[model samples]
Target: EDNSLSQKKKVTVEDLFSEDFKIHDPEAKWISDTEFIYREQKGTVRLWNVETNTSTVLIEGKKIESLRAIRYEISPDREYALFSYNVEPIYQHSYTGYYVLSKIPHGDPQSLDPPEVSNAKLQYAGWGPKGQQLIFIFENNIYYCAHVGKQAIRVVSTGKEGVIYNGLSDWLYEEEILKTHIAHWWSPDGTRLAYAAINDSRVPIMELPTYTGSIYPTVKPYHYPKAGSENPSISLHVIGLNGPTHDLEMMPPDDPRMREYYITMVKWATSTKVAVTWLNRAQNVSILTLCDATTGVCTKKHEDESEAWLHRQNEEPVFSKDGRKFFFIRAIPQGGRGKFYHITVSSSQPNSSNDNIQSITSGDWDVTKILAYDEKGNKIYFLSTEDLPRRRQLYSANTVGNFNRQCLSCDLVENCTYFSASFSHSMDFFLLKCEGPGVPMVTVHNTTDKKKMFDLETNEHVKKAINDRQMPKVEYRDIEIDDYNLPMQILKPATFTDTTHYPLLLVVDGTPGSQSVAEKFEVSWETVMVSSHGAVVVKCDGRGSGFQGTKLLHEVRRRLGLLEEKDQMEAVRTMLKEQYIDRTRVAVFGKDYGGYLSTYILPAKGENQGQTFTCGSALSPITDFKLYASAFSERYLGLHGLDNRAYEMTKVAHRVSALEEQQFLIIHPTADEKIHFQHTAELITQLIRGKANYSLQIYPDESHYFTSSSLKQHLYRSIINFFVECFRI
Candidate 1:
């Protein structure tokens, strides 16, 4: 008999879901240049000192009345902490919870509410930069506190539950514009607070059914805005706290007209000035403006118009401390290749145009993010795709001089190609994260010279878990298609042989400006298929993917699903040429945007699209862009009124007949908030008329991500089992 104890184990679907195989992320937050804090096991919070390599408990889990706090925020002065528990998710990135305030080290927990109310549920809460000043939103209304124990003061009284949101984002802003629940910004000195008051009275409502335990199907109302629909109107306001509180409303640019517009970005340029960006309803034009907090006068600083659509909706312009200059990322032409997003510095003066802006970095690749501005060293740190389109590395460029650039994480860690960094407030220390082709690791580094201080998280458990299993092997390839090099990643079975044929799973995500081929280390359900089922998995970033250049990314500009689906079909055709891939046993799978692409590719008819994928699976797929969010759908497909033809062509319902002979499965939660469950319902209605061969599964009272742990496990197994049946094994 074989030595059973010494044999490496196969990775099962359950193994992928177990915590033993998961990489532990430190999730460390900077407290100072020399100290940081991270949550320990069982909800204990500990402060770690880098200089002494010592840790002390800040919040003991057993001492807080035996209630596990899910999240905590330390005050600026380290005198107190705000803890949240019993959190309930409302939408993507937004939540409601019970909040309590307690002093640091040891103190009795107290609810963050007025003396009149006992235990009020808060929508959101955050700390200001100075002392223990903080703000919280309840019932869509904002309240401010001057100190830890001070009486709360109502900042805005116009808030009504589902109509007007004060210092909070409504459905549209939270999903697409601000991309966060918190909409308010505190001045550096904490003397003034800026917030957006959103009015959603005119927006239409969407109702999703909830099958609660004792209910006969209750309904949840959402103030959702579809494409070309009425959006929430917002007014930016600033309140001064240095003296008697006085509020002033800031105006937006006048050229775009007040009827339909969106506030895409907002930042505090100075103690008295706030920078704001306004985009037209078409999303083709954006104006950067500086608003005076005291006088309520707004000055138009720069304007950018795009033939297609602007790149990022929430791209904040980093302003200098003195408020004389600012830096932002915008597309600039590179000869022949296409336009790449480059960092540009511009004067903060009025009427600052392209002629006055200075481009700091220019290349075929794009600068992904402007990380920080080290004013003391005159350096601007950023992350870029200079090494490769899919790999992100940290780099710094001199603010002045010849704009000389240096790569900080090029070869900092072995087997690491992608990295991210977070700098301390004073810019003396940084937490370097090696999120990579290898196991992820976190380290502390000195900013003066890119020297590693010590290891923060080594992920040794993940390493040991992998070492005990027979894992899959990964290889990268470049597929050539009409002057474009499509980046592809293939995960192969460890016990592979060239003589054997393998079933292929073509994982696709055809979202515009989204990349699926990357170096980030992940062992997901696909890994289980490769290791246990001996299947080949492929992912290709074809045209319309990001980081390469706008030329390829904008190929799907007016028509949302046409070019993206075509490119993925072409990629599948190219992959079929390989001998190891069993052409007849191919399947495609994706979720969210990827889920849309999966279904879109199944019904594709032209351009080498015959039976490319024998079967497919989609999770929370978007059937029509017409039903999607206004900010996302309109940005790529143009205004629905002007581009009705494009919208109609992108609908999966229009091609249901093509899926009549194909096998496919769709899984969606009944209460999905991102891509509503209505999408799968509509697509199935079309499939029913066409007599298509399809499978359907729905989870009641679950959201987009399947919040239930057992549901996630079942989801992975369902996809895997569906593929097994498709492959006839």
Candidate 2:
């Protein structure tokens, strides 16, 4: 207990045992302005109460298995909880889709009761404003359950299976737009509910053939909308609980086009007015319209057009406390820098209006998320990169009056690994949930005293095991590429020194996926193994990656591999200019769509003279777009019958002869699901016919993502050895 001695001692993994990473179970949310909720490995959800400076168990282990606690709903009153659990046979890599609704009162696990199971699979669930009922999606239909014992009642029947989905998104919308499962919303009064109904009958279906389980291989059909393909038709629908349920369709009849249009995001303004966004097939022209919920009539509130395709802004609109004003971000292109206009809709609209759109935060920097706004305080809180463009940090600014901004997390060189936070209804206190390298996530509640409310991850043993592992330190750097700045992350060797020039390994997640600047722990076995051999691993978000806004992000829309390859080549060129990187010994590695890019780059001509690109690896590469399933292929590359040029440009296998002289390795798992093994198989056969110098390795039981730890480790080791041998470094 000697304070002086404790200060002098070095901290180790053992010291992590005392760290407050665990949460109290049953109640998974922190009860303070600054608090967070985390699920411990021990199968319990914890809630840290910052007001009382204590933590409590919100759910128990048995309850965790019965209900999917991670995907539960916490009511606004913070008194009741609702969650769903599986009751059917679970598929591989899939949770039993079936769900049940359970209730918990005020962070008490002991008071928890067994859930009421419904006939349909519960896709999503949310609490009503008064917490007196639950609204959820089941079998593509909207349903509501009033009180705990009440049976589920269907709100909207959409009628078509696998074609019409009500209150929930289809495959493309879920993957691309909402980016999450839940999409339906309830109005403040809880009398009206707004939702999206998608009709995918016209959209083509992508068939993923699975061969692992039964005697007959089955196909998993999904509706996928690619770049130029026909997208699912979407419309906004609202239902009134008080009166007879009426279907209010909001789309215009005359604007009929085969091209995909989106009217999926619906937000209620006053139960009478609902806001909906409509985009043209190309997604380049977008219009926000306010619809009368009582009728189906809609009036244009605002319209945003782009020279290129416009993006769908899906975040729910923020309304003033008294419903006087509403705010939403609008995408605008100006001065070579992407900008957003925060448009405020005044309730006095046509009367004596205060309605106006203003560019609140304008600059080269992109706004990531709008966190919280204090109308009384006249301040808005958001996560942006005006200070550090690569990483997101918390910032607050005045909505008006000089608009002074301040950073709340304090300036730290290390990336603050906070995922999400919640401000109490009162807005006086906040809870922050965060984690980093060797740091298990902890929920800290901020108050006048500014202390941790409680440890959410209560199991000290599990936290100790995680802390014992050496997590790679992520370093972010901005590299100038083709007159534009590209954000990149460098994962140096744990015992790295600046004196030596290490072999460089570049990783691309995908063309559209943001891989580089993410602050996740380097769990990829391949990256760690490659780094162990004195390799400098680098990942950069090239021009085409999403979440950076539309202009820079959608550069490769019609041109997939062309611009992306050029931007990536530019980044590599910039890195080679640095003295510490070995110009003659550079290798590229990627899987899935990224694999396609790697295949294209390795065979192409080098940008810089004598900058010999030695090694390349592609796992399950999408070699031929023509051979790909109808759903995914047609979306990005228009249907082969319709647009042959787009298909030919994206399909790399059409140009397989270009790889005859390159040094590359192609790997695929026999049991791959997403992109079939046939892709790499056909590519290898073509290369062999051409007598190309390349290596192919196929793992027997591995899936698209090598799930087996031993196989993954072996794969990583193979990659490291391949690069070392090819580069002779």
Candidate 3:
């Protein structure tokens, strides 16, 4: 009973290590009121029964280290397990050359079958209704595997490569939008299959030069469409199991402009109606159309428009149980916040007017996710930040949008974690995964008057190792800049006191998809080394940060470096006003978008006194937008044909004369997959021509992220030594 001994025991990394953290892939679902299946990295699958609070491993790694697995359900009555594994040596920048599929028996692993289609990669796999057959996609075609024949048949044949794609999404669709696989859908009856037919023959092709020869280098050609460029033409097709396969005409052929538009999402509303979303070339106007699978006609259900270019809406639309009502997020014109809308679907022909669209949840806040729709109870459970803008919490509201909403989770602003929930088919139970600082990820089940929690996974070994090491303590604060409040997270040395004035390191993420929050862990050795040397590390999300919505995010539109630099400099000035921060001993660091910002700020004349920077870390910076790739360059600066001036000014070389005071250490990796080293090579050449004092470090065989641990350590060491020598820390 003595807890003192347990508390005093030294915690080693080995004791804290766990197989759970080895997970490369993780998935969960609510199978029954008290049962669920959990899948983790390398094909490790387990089944848990909430009623008994126990778990059983369903599958283990059978010499497969890179296999990705998922749980598939055909209907309420049928369940099956599926996974994808690499089978051949990987060439190019691709992960797996081929994939295999195998059937997992319910409640039994001994009955598992050897993988099907071991030679050709299996792109996607799922069970059909009644678990009678399995559907999968391979080499741009769809196939069906039935147990009776003990063989898989090529059910749907897409044309040769670079032509017709049946089940799999193309490069742009996978990279820019949707961001997922399994482009095809299986009907509830398993009688038919719905798939997307993408025609990319007209999409522009970009090339990257790969050095592989003794003399002349070869270029690898790839299909990439940048902003304002031509996008792949897409249409939906419904194929029947029995003979007559029909191609549903969702849009008219006469409308040439719509061909360039993107089909963001598509789902079967029923046997007849298919829900589809169409976004214009600029991605600002979105039209949701319901297509009739039988007649090949579409009816516009709703339209969402934004003044600024709209990327695909983050939230997914939810369909009602009866397929009559659908819920989605619509961008509000006043602010960038999204409002939830519930609409009924109907035909457009004379007495066949589509169901009326009604606003379900209206407010200044955004709806994060649609958790569940309890039609029988007339309530909808959702995740939103209505109470706190920075954090998301669970709430339940009436379907009619008249009743007061109720909060379900405890209020903790710092507990800014909770992905979408997995609900049972009957909506009787749901699973919620939540995590926060100092807290491991945990999954919990919730039902009427009953609540059970279980730890899903955590990085205990990493946590213990960090605790044992003399790491700095992170501090959060707000700085007022440009008459606007900017949030900053500062990590100070563990030996800090009020009297100490340490050197400063400014870190920034100029683009969206990156955050400066202190809660998450980053394995960048350079950041750790900088802090270990008693430098005050500071990171601030500037004006162009993504999560803040459109208004704040669009500040960098057309004018990239102007607004971001001002805000960053203002942040540094505000920090310098504090007694403990030494303004003269400050250095800036970042990569990619951050690298562009650091390079831009190093040359700025005033307020950033005694500031130094290390700029070369960015793999492929847009040093000269005029020479950059058209697909990526035109997205922000507009199309090249229409507006050439915008692209000309946004390049970093145009403003290189500003670097009169700051010193820089520019680093780049030779074989960066995303950005080419030519960007750094050209910039360094320009700097040399301009007689600028900057150091360059180029690593061989290292990619954009410096993923190699040895090269990463070397880079960090160089960074720490550079900062120390520059600032005399």
Candidate 4:
């Protein structure tokens, strides 16, 4: 018993709430080259000067009465702040929230009201690019205010409840298309605003029932277009705010097949011209057009078609000052290994061919994102996996002549590998977020010299918290399967030794074009399971994963779950051959797509599927692709009617007959909007009919991501306890 006193502490459920293991990001927003705005722990907003090493409080939360805003969007001139509070989230990125306005440095909060409703919350509110100009979406309509403390001008009145949405994305656009709640863009001069008008009248509706203390369950209906169903009709429009409001619709592409297309990308090429990308429902064809904001006449700038589906359609192109040349990332073939996504510059002229396009960066790795283009320096800043496929580092490349490139984050931090940056408007400074193989930290840097100015958040608490603890050790491994080297991340106990066999837990996320095995500092229930339960946690980036090349990414196209599940099982079989792993006490877990794959791998197969997992836990798994979002399902597996066999083969409910001998757990929220409860319910009926060995847990009125702290803790406990009991530890 005395020896137990010296034993290191294991992470408990309460540790999930602490900041010790959490990566505390600064969430810094650059206001200028020398200053940026950020939030403090006490709910106050402050502007920090990088050069002066000082912070000035902009919004004093303690002084205000009954106003506790969760997020703040500072105005361009830094004269005011737009705050959002009492948020009622709708989708992954959008919410219906109330807004309060206040002048910077000491001002009383003024409640903002929508045009017609006096007490209704605004669908969205954000600051424009110039002065104190702002925009708000309420009741699906868009309103513009030139200044604070003034009445708002209604820009579009055609918005209808759940039918038509202007300047805000619906469920389809929010989840699959824009990936953002704000469906509007501001020009550089801030004189013009372009937005999308989404008409959802033709889209099918999905109603989810909520059981929140009501005697009878009530259904919340929203427009959700399923596979092969009619998607929302989206049209782009530009509105001028300088003088009399002149709103004109930007015409779609000139092809007949584009009558029912989706607007994937929108940006301003010049003050008078806007660049928009349109894609067909199949998502294999893309047309980039530059439209005159005044006349709404669109001219084709570029066009790209893929034999496989287009991977990234929303990548914004950086245009030259004269709008004649632009740069973006696209897949280019590399010898015989496959096609890797690289940076390429293209001529914006209509008929420029021979001098049309030039590839800037090339390698086996991929350029993940193009950050900013320095016009004066004639260089482009981007993030890439040049050093390692699973790591991301910032790099800059010259767009002219020899196309010289430099890695900015190679030795910038000691143990940091994964990185992201936010550049200032002037491109002189950037906020570097160093996410980790070690403790995460954020710091400021000069763009020219790459000198670290100062640290914004070192997360010193996280460093000290693990000093005396017997923390889990992490390592990277490459497993050869089918002539492809797949990457896997393994987390094991600190006292790990090959002489002792340990239970295994596989974390599977087989989302198309997703790389799960990255070197980022993350601590969750898995970390606790490794430390306390002495189980090894593994995440494998198998076939159909991203960052390596398109040959690997597009393998599962139109086949969805078949190849991904096979790769996962093979990975497990490889691990079972190792002496360090307990082949009989293996488990699997995932959420959403991961959930689907975890459950899909439970059955034992006679065809060399060795050492099946003993148990698995799936959260909000999709049973059928046909019942999922159209934009997602159609992009992966062609249109539903085009390939009916693919849908039947990919459905998880089809494999319940073989799952009777494997113990698994299925969990879902009744109010899950992304992967609906219908999926779990469908799987449950099949499981009952097949007499499968499974357990079910339901969270009433919760979302796909549980927002309630109590329910979230309960969920972690339930999952951890299930795996523990399955392993009998």
Candidate 4 lDDT tens digits, 1-729? 555555777777777666675555568888777788765533565778887777886767543453666566778888876778887666676667888887776666777886666767888888888888988888888888898866888877789999998888888887777888789888878888999999988888887877685787678888878889888998888888867888999888867755568999999999898889999888888888889998999888777777778887879888877886788777878666888888888776647444476799977878888998887876689998899888898999998878898888887877888998989877888988877888878888988888887787888878887764667899887787665678888887778787878998899887877789888887788888888788888789888888777888788887787877777877777777788787678888999989998887777666475447788889999888888988998887778866667788777766657774568788888888989888888888888887777789888877776766788889888888888888874
Candidate 3, residue 296: lDDT: 65
Number of clashes in model 4?
Answer: 0
Ranking by lDDT: 4, 1, 2, 3
Q: In model 1, which residue pairs have backbone atoms overlapping below 3 Å?
A: none
lDDT of 1 by residue, 553-634 (tens): 7777876767666667777777778898876787888889888878777654565746756888899899788888888888
lDDT by residue for model 2 (1-729), tens: 655532122222222222342332323443445444534445555665555644466655655454544355556555566555553322122222444444464333321222354354545566787756766565566767666565557667663767988766665665555554455777768877777777888877766556664787677666654434556777777787665777676754234432456663567767677777776554455666777777879876666666555544565666666555566666655366454433333342533232366556666665566776777776566676556544556666776757776666543324344334456655666555444433434445453344554544433543554455433456777666554566887765455666977788778765563535666432454344433455677777777765565566656665778877777777777777778787667788888888888777664464445334678888888876765544345434445556568766676655556554457888887666556677887787877776777888877644555544466557766765677677663
- The clash count of every prediction, one per candidate, is 0, 30, 5, 0
Error of 3 at 97 (Å): 4.2
Per-residue error (Å), model 4, residue 565: 2.0
Estimate every model's Cα lDDT from 0 to 1. Answer: 0.80, 0.60, 0.58, 0.81
Clashing pairs in 4: none
* Per-model RMSD to reference: 2.4, 6.2, 5.5, 2.3
Model 3 poorest ten-residue lDDT run = 87-96
TM-score: model 1 vs. ground truth? 0.95
Native-to-model Cα distance after best TM-score fit, residue 221 in candidate 3, in Å: 2.0
* Regions of candidate 4 where Cα sits further than 4 Å from its true position: 1-5, 41-45, 61-66, 352-355, 607-611
Highest lDDT: give the candidate number: 4
